[PDB]
Write a protein that holds these residues in place. Sequence first.
Motif, PDB file in Angstrom:
ATOM      1  N   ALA A 143      -2.038   7.715   6.368  1.00 25.68           N
ATOM      2  CA  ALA A 143      -2.178   6.287   6.711  1.00 25.68           C
ATOM      3  C   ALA A 143      -1.007   5.763   7.504  1.00 25.68           C
ATOM      4  O   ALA A 143      -1.172   5.291   8.639  1.00 25.68           O
ATOM      5  CB  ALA A 143      -2.378   5.446   5.463  1.00 25.68           C
ATOM      6  N   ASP A 144       0.179   5.826   6.905  1.00 26.65           N
ATOM      7  CA  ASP A 144       1.378   5.399   7.600  1.00 26.65           C
ATOM      8  C   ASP A 144       1.493   6.106   8.954  1.00 26.65           C
ATOM      9  O   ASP A 144       1.757   5.468   9.951  1.00 26.65           O
ATOM     10  CB  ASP A 144       2.608   5.606   6.734  1.00 26.65           C
ATOM     11  CG  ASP A 144       2.569   4.763   5.478  1.00 26.65           C
ATOM     12  OD1 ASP A 144       2.134   3.596   5.563  1.00 26.65           O
ATOM     13  OD2 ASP A 144       2.932   5.179   4.360  1.00 26.65           O
TER      14      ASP A 144
ATOM     15  N   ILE B 246      -0.861   7.235  10.851  1.00 27.67           N
ATOM     16  CA  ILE B 246      -1.817   6.590  11.746  1.00 27.67           C
ATOM     17  C   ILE B 246      -1.261   5.236  12.207  1.00 27.67           C
ATOM     18  O   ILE B 246      -1.414   4.852  13.366  1.00 27.67           O
ATOM     19  CB  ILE B 246      -3.235   6.428  11.041  1.00 27.67           C
ATOM     20  CG1 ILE B 246      -3.934   7.798  10.872  1.00 27.67           C
ATOM     21  CG2 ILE B 246      -4.130   5.472  11.811  1.00 27.67           C
ATOM     22  CD1 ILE B 246      -3.694   8.795  12.034  1.00 27.67           C
ATOM     23  N   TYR B 247      -0.588   4.543  11.295  1.00 26.03           N
ATOM     24  CA  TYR B 247      -0.002   3.235  11.578  1.00 26.03           C
ATOM     25  C   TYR B 247       1.126   3.307  12.589  1.00 26.03           C
ATOM     26  O   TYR B 247       1.281   2.408  13.412  1.00 26.03           O
ATOM     27  CB  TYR B 247       0.525   2.620  10.292  1.00 26.03           C
ATOM     28  CG  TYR B 247       1.129   1.252  10.459  1.00 26.03           C
ATOM     29  CD1 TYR B 247       2.477   1.028  10.209  1.00 26.03           C
ATOM     30  CD2 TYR B 247       0.351   0.181  10.843  1.00 26.03           C
ATOM     31  CE1 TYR B 247       3.025  -0.231  10.349  1.00 26.03           C
ATOM     32  CE2 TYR B 247       0.882  -1.070  10.978  1.00 26.03           C
ATOM     33  CZ  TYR B 247       2.217  -1.277  10.733  1.00 26.03           C
ATOM     34  OH  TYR B 247       2.742  -2.539  10.875  1.00 26.03           O
ATOM     35  N   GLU B 248       1.926   4.374  12.501  1.00 23.08           N
ATOM     36  CA  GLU B 248       3.049   4.604  13.421  1.00 23.08           C
ATOM     37  C   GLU B 248       2.554   5.070  14.783  1.00 23.08           C
ATOM     38  O   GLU B 248       2.908   4.496  15.795  1.00 23.08           O
ATOM     39  CB  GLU B 248       4.015   5.646  12.850  1.00 23.08           C
ATOM     40  CG  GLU B 248       4.608   5.291  11.490  1.00 23.08           C
ATOM     41  CD  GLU B 248       5.476   6.406  10.928  1.00 23.08           C
ATOM     42  OE1 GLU B 248       6.178   7.070  11.734  1.00 23.08           O
ATOM     43  OE2 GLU B 248       5.460   6.621   9.692  1.00 23.08           O
TER      44      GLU B 248
ATOM     45  N   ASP C 294      -1.276   7.973   1.612  1.00 24.90           N
ATOM     46  CA  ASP C 294      -0.128   7.216   2.125  1.00 24.90           C
ATOM     47  C   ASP C 294       0.528   7.924   3.355  1.00 24.90           C
ATOM     48  O   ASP C 294       1.010   7.259   4.268  1.00 24.90           O
ATOM     49  CB  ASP C 294       0.907   6.931   1.022  1.00 24.90           C
ATOM     50  CG  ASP C 294       0.682   5.577   0.329  1.00 24.90           C
ATOM     51  OD1 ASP C 294       1.242   5.367  -0.779  1.00 24.90           O
ATOM     52  OD2 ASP C 294      -0.020   4.667   0.826  1.00 24.90           O
ATOM     53  N   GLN C 295       0.521   9.266   3.366  1.00 33.69           N
ATOM     54  CA  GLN C 295       1.053  10.037   4.500  1.00 33.69           C
ATOM     55  C   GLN C 295       0.210   9.769   5.708  1.00 33.69           C
ATOM     56  O   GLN C 295       0.645   9.095   6.632  1.00 33.69           O
ATOM     57  CB  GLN C 295       1.036  11.549   4.227  1.00 33.69           C
ATOM     58  CG  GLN C 295       1.891  12.005   3.063  1.00 33.69           C
ATOM     59  CD  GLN C 295       3.322  11.485   3.117  1.00 33.69           C
ATOM     60  OE1 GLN C 295       4.243  12.238   3.437  1.00 33.69           O
ATOM     61  NE2 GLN C 295       3.514  10.204   2.769  1.00 33.69           N
TER      62      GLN C 295
ATOM     63  N   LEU D 133      -9.207   0.894   5.378  1.00 34.46           N
ATOM     64  CA  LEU D 133      -9.416   2.322   5.160  1.00 34.46           C
ATOM     65  C   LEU D 133      -9.907   2.609   3.715  1.00 34.46           C
ATOM     66  O   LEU D 133     -10.770   3.477   3.500  1.00 34.46           O
ATOM     67  CB  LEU D 133      -8.103   3.075   5.456  1.00 34.46           C
ATOM     68  CG  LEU D 133      -8.008   4.355   6.319  1.00 34.46           C
ATOM     69  CD1 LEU D 133      -9.090   4.476   7.403  1.00 34.46           C
ATOM     70  CD2 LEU D 133      -6.640   4.393   6.948  1.00 34.46           C
TER      71      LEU D 133
ATOM     72  N   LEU E 282      -4.436  -2.188   7.131  1.00 33.57           N
ATOM     73  CA  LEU E 282      -5.056  -0.938   7.578  1.00 33.57           C
ATOM     74  C   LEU E 282      -5.583  -0.156   6.377  1.00 33.57           C
ATOM     75  O   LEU E 282      -6.734   0.291   6.358  1.00 33.57           O
ATOM     76  CB  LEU E 282      -4.048  -0.063   8.321  1.00 33.57           C
ATOM     77  CG  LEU E 282      -4.490   1.396   8.503  1.00 33.57           C
ATOM     78  CD1 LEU E 282      -5.507   1.536   9.635  1.00 33.57           C
ATOM     79  CD2 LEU E 282      -3.309   2.303   8.741  1.00 33.57           C
ATOM     80  N   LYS E 283      -4.724   0.014   5.378  1.00 28.28           N
ATOM     81  CA  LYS E 283      -5.100   0.714   4.158  1.00 28.28           C
ATOM     82  C   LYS E 283      -6.274  -0.006   3.469  1.00 28.28           C
ATOM     83  O   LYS E 283      -7.219   0.629   3.022  1.00 28.28           O
ATOM     84  CB  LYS E 283      -3.886   0.843   3.238  1.00 28.28           C
ATOM     85  CG  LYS E 283      -2.672   1.540   3.908  1.00 28.28           C
ATOM     86  CD  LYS E 283      -1.450   1.600   2.964  1.00 28.28           C
ATOM     87  CE  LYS E 283      -0.418   2.649   3.423  1.00 28.28           C
ATOM     88  NZ  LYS E 283       0.719   2.793   2.462  1.00 28.28           N
TER      89      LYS E 283
ATOM     90  N   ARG F 261       0.079  -3.314   7.957  1.00 31.96           N
ATOM     91  CA  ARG F 261       0.102  -1.918   7.546  1.00 31.96           C
ATOM     92  C   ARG F 261      -0.823  -1.774   6.325  1.00 31.96           C
ATOM     93  O   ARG F 261      -1.640  -0.849   6.235  1.00 31.96           O
ATOM     94  CB  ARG F 261       1.524  -1.526   7.175  1.00 31.96           C
ATOM     95  CG  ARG F 261       1.687  -0.118   6.718  1.00 31.96           C
ATOM     96  CD  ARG F 261       2.900   0.078   5.839  1.00 31.96           C
ATOM     97  NE  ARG F 261       3.567   1.324   6.160  1.00 31.96           N
ATOM     98  CZ  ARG F 261       4.520   1.445   7.075  1.00 31.96           C
ATOM     99  NH1 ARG F 261       4.938   0.381   7.761  1.00 31.96           N
ATOM    100  NH2 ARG F 261       5.060   2.629   7.302  1.00 31.96           N
TER     101      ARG F 261
END
Lengths: 89, 378, 53, 89, 105, 48, 60
Positions: G38-39, G41-43, G35-36, F17, F13-14, F10
């Motif tokens: 991103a997460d 996108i991750y989910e 963070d919104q 990004l 990814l950041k 996770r």
Amino acid sequence: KNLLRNALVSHLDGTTPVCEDIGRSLLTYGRRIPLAEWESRIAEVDARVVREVCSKYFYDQCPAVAGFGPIEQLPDYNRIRSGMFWLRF
Amino acid sequence: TNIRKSHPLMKIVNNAFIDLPAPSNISSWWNFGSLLGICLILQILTGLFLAMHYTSDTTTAFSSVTHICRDVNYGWIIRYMHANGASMFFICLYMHVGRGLYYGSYTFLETWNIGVILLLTVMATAFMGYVLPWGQMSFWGATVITNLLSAIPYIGTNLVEWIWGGFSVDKATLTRFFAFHFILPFIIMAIAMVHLLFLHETGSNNPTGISSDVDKIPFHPYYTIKDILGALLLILALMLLVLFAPDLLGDPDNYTPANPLNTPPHIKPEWYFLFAYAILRSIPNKLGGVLALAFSILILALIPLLHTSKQRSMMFRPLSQCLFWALVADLLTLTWIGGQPVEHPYITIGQLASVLYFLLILVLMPTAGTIENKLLKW
Amino acid sequence: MLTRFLGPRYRQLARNWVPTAQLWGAVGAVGLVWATDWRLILDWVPYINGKFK
Amino acid sequence: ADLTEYLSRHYKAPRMVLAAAGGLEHRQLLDLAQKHFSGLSGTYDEDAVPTLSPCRFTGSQICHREDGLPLAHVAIAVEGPGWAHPDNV
Amino acid sequence: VSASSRWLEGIRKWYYNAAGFNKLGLMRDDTIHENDDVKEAIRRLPENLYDDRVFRIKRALDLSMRQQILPKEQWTKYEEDKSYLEPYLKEVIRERKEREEWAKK
Amino acid sequence: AEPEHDHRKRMGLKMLLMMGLLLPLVYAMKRHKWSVLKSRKLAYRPPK
Amino acid sequence: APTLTARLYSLLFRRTSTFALTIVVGALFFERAFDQGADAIYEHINEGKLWKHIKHKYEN
Ligand code: HEM
Ligand code: HEM
Ligand SMILES: CCCCCC[C@H]1C(=O)O[C@H](C)[C@H](NC(=O)c2cccc(NC=O)c2O)C(=O)O[C@@H](C)[C@@H]1OC(=O)C(C)C
């Protein structure tokens, strides 16, 4: 301001310096700015005007540098550029 | 008056990376000096956070590390950044020395030499480093290696047991190594400054080996930002490992605790000693093998005595340029062999690569140099 | 004996750097807030509520 | 030919100013000006439009290194406003 | 003068072009390692040579930074390559050797 | 064996990004400053 | 009507005060929004979470 008043009055001393100011001023200002008017312009100026006017032309502005001679220690343009602003302000 | 120049402290800082004149000329191969610095501190920094949770004691050694990875808030990134930063510290160390030979930098004797001292110490450090988790590789890695001093005539035995604290690797050996793995990077950090001190005496060499006095630029802007970008790149790489491929460069069997009874037919030191490993066993001798292993690194301190060329950088030297790459590829060979079992093809080829190595640095490059002189009419 | 700095000019110097010193405390407050995720102060900011329903 | 053409191009009355300072009387000056200067723009030009295009300023730097000179000269400037701007004062 | 002397000359012209400094406008002598002897000879150059050498090396260091080279028609043509520093270097070496020789007796 | 497994990626990814905005930026910054050097013009003007 | 970048420079970038103020004010909102997205996108690319697993166990 006083320096400038002194300068002005002192500079306009004698036929030549005056004559040149007439002719040249007519070219540039279209008219002749009577001493009194300059005195009024100078009087108007005080700290605030200086800070505001200086900042307008100098603050964070790009310089034109010219060097000649043993200039190895003349700072790099970036460095001179950086010196045209303060990180405190 | 500018306090940035007359204050006893800033002086140093002004001289380090503000007003120091540097070649308008250096390229990316000069970044690994900051990267090594960064490496050194980041290593010191994660390393410390692991020490607030690590232990020592053979019983808890392995247990504590897992404790960190699983229980300690964020202990995993710290642990893996430490272990991966360690590899990066070698990639850079390697690249740095590389940059050095190619470009003739080694002509700064004191600086080069301090750098060799810097090499052995981080090697000596990283070695002790991996013994710590007390895994399989840690135990025999800590055994296969250390022993070597037992090849030293007459007193070899004594020393190897003195460094051991017993008759084998145990109790006395893990605590020892931890403590040494703790104090070394500080000492290194000092040596680094002396390295850097001697470097400031001449300023930096450059891609042409010519002399940039005629065109120096201030470290201010220029190399500070070109060091920042650079460091960001080093972060990308270190993070790529840690966050996507944590064990890619790590031997999976340093997991599973120790065991003086076992020994898993394979075992090699961490990647960065493979070329050296290959050399040592590519010799049917206890004394010769270790003697050759030593020369394998201590030869760097010999390089300057075999500078034969009238030019400093290899920038304009095709002949040597070829032998340089032959050296690199050949080291990549030794690394590969080192990684393989002592069997059929692998033996004779790693035996050839060894000879090549020493013959290339000791005879080939020095001759390539003289021929180039002769070709140019020098 | 900080009397050397008591006069008209100092008073003008002091006043000139008032906006700066002010904005520089704004930077530090917000800075402290954002860095420690100040539960107290932040709840008030419209968005940034990563602790609501 | 290069010269005379610059002369006729630029030495035209609406761009000249007879100036004087001292023991004269303005009328006497006017008389003279009208006596010796009459007939300069008895021809106001067709399409010769002597207009000054504004000039770009450039944050730039020129260094003429010469370690054979004993002392260095440096000149640094920023873009100014120009003759008529009240900011000058 | 031989057919094969042109060959040696040809191997030399070949290396020269390969060595590559000429693309940066350098001259062979502009690329010598600076050591005591070389430093002393650099000292003995007359103004114009010294100034020209400085300009050259500046031009290269400059190129080297942009990682460019000069247009081909401006590269240093081997054979037009003036060995301007050899005579001084040679003289500086001679006198050192005389010293070295005096120190033995 | 690797509980952190999902968080790890996770963040990863950041990390990609983030670097995806930073690498170009911290690079455009270095260009700016070096541009003074990159377009600099030399002239050699010896006497006579 | 000047430019966005122009108007932006005058009001906030000119003074190192406001310049810095802008970035600390701009970092707070960025950490949140990045963070919104991103997460999220991750989910969106996952879904074998413990999020959609809960619906099953509100009881005990
Ligand atoms: C503790 C590990 C080391 C650190 C922290 C370190 C740090 C540095 C730094 C900051 C520079 C200047 C920047 C650069 O040229 O990249 C440098 C240059 C140099 N170092 Fe090291 N270095 C280390 C290991 C070495 C090694 C392994 C050698 C060679 C055995 C070495 C010999 C040199 C030399 C000769 C230079 C001059 C490079 C040049 O002028 O082009 N140091 N080092
Ligand atoms: C003085 C700062 C340092 C401290 C406090 C420190 C402390 C530690 C501790 C407690 C461990 C065991 C925990 C673990 O394995 O993750 C460890 C592992 C290690 N560290 Fe350090 N160390 C420091 C500097 C270094 C340096 C300079 C290096 C060399 C790059 C280094 C490379 C290693 C290695 C190779 C390991 C074992 C490899 C692995 O984790 O699998 N550390 N360190
Ligand atoms: C704490 C951070 C402040 C920095 C002071 C210490 C650090 C220091 O001294 O800084 C300067 C930056 C020093 N030189 C360079 O980086 C450097 C020199 C020429 C060229 C480049 N790059 C690209 O051409 C460089 O990057 C360098 O990079 O050395 C480090 C190893 C040292 O670091 C050390 O000592 C450790 C012992 C701390």
